[PDB]
């Protein structure tokens, strides 16, 4: 019950009582990004380098916390990591503490949701990696270009 002139009530008069530091402001964040309870979170623990795999699963059509445009456009750009059961699958490796792996997967998830939710994204194409792809595409286009009615 001792006090000094430097104590925490005198430095900060506004918030004093013990209960004030421990209150929970659930209303300030009401959007609850990524409602973790509805995700399947798997841990593959390997040891040799130590690498703890973080796995992240949810059903895209069945997930309500994402709006329909978000649902459908996250199913397009990302179709490579989608599973036949309708699952979107996220993978994390680098840390050997599974905490950071979870954080990485949740972050990739927030980035896919962000990039999809922003309509103004022009998906900028680099000509450096895709130049050979554009050339080979045009060149197979010149062969496809033969016009005769078939079948």
């Amino acid at each position: 019950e001792f006090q000094s002139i430097y104590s925490l009530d005198k430095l900060y008069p506004e918030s004093r009582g013990s209960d004030t530091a421990w209150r929970l402001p659930d209303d300030a964040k009401q959007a609850n990004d990524i409602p973790v309870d509805r995700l399947t979170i798997s841990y593959c623990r390997s040891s040799g380098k130590v690498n703890s795999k973080a796995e992240v699963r949810f059903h895209l059509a069945s997930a309500d916390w994402i709006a329909e445009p978000v649902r459908l456009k996250l199913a397009v750009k990302h179709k490579n990591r989608i599973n036949r059961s309708g699952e979107l699958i996220l993978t994390s490796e680098c840390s050997r503490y599974q905490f950071r792996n979870l954080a990485d997967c949740l972050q990739k998830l927030r980035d896919m949701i962000a990039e999809a939710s922003q309509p103004x994204x022009x998906x900028x194409x680099x000509x450096x990696x895709l130049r050979r792809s554009r050339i080979e595409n045009m060149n197979r286009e010149r062969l496809r270009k033969k016009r005769i009615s078939s079948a």
């Binding site: 380098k49 130590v50 690498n51 179709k79 036949r84 840390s95 050997r96």
Partner: protein, 54 residues
Amino acid sequence: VTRVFHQLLDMREPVFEFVRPPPYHPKQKRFPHRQPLRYLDRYRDSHEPTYGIY
């Protein structure tokens, strides 16, 4: 292709990658002589500190 494997063959679709053999390092020596500091990091197991008994 994804339409094939699932609908026809009732099978998960395989995905392959390209692996290039890990760069060869000479045996590490107890007193590496005349080497840069970063020499130590070539034999690095994984990147994370480990406080052994601490």
